[PDB]
Amino acid sequence: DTTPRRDAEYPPPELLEALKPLHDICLGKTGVTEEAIKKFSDEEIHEDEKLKCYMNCLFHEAKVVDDNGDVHLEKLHDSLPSSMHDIAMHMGKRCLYPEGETLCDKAFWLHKCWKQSDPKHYFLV
Numbered sequence: 001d002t003t004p005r006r007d008a009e010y011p012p013p014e015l016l017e018a019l020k021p022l023h024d025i026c027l028g029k030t031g032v033t034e035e036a037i038k039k040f041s042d043e044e045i046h047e048d049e050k051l052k053c054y055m056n057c058l059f060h061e062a063k064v065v066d067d068n069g070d071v072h073l074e075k076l077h078d079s080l081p082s083s084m085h086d087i088a089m090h091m092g093k094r095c096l097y098p099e100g101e102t103l104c105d106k107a108f109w110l111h112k113c114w115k116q117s118d119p120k121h122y123f124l125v
């Protein structure tokens with residue numbers, strides 16, 4: 001079952017809420033559209049270069065990157081609500097080592113990898 005779970009409990013409302021202002025900042029900086037974000041979240045993987053940098057911006061704004069701006073997966077896992085701890089771990093267990101030239105490339109690589117592993121529970125806002 002690969003259909004996206006979207007209800008009052010999941011994605012966690014408190015997480016969506018905390019991310020919203022970061023979304024406003026990162027959408028403003030990169031010029032990505034809302035539609036591009038929703039389509040990646042809920043339908044099919046697609047390559048939009050501004051979406052990739054939006055994704056990178058979100059990791060930075062969320063303070064889950066190391067000193068070189070790379071995603072620090074332990075910090076990301078700790079920043080998630082406890083209720084999604086196990087799902088996120090299985091979703092990321094074969095996505096440990098991102099490939100790509102730029103920080104935007106590696107951020108896209110991760111998101112794509114998480115979405116392929118568990119498209120029901122994967123989301124982007």
Ligand SMILES: CC(=O)CCC=C(C)C
Pocket residue numbers: 073074076077080088089091092093114
């Ligand atoms: C937080 C997430 O989505 C992936 C984390 C992956 C680990 C801890 C192996």
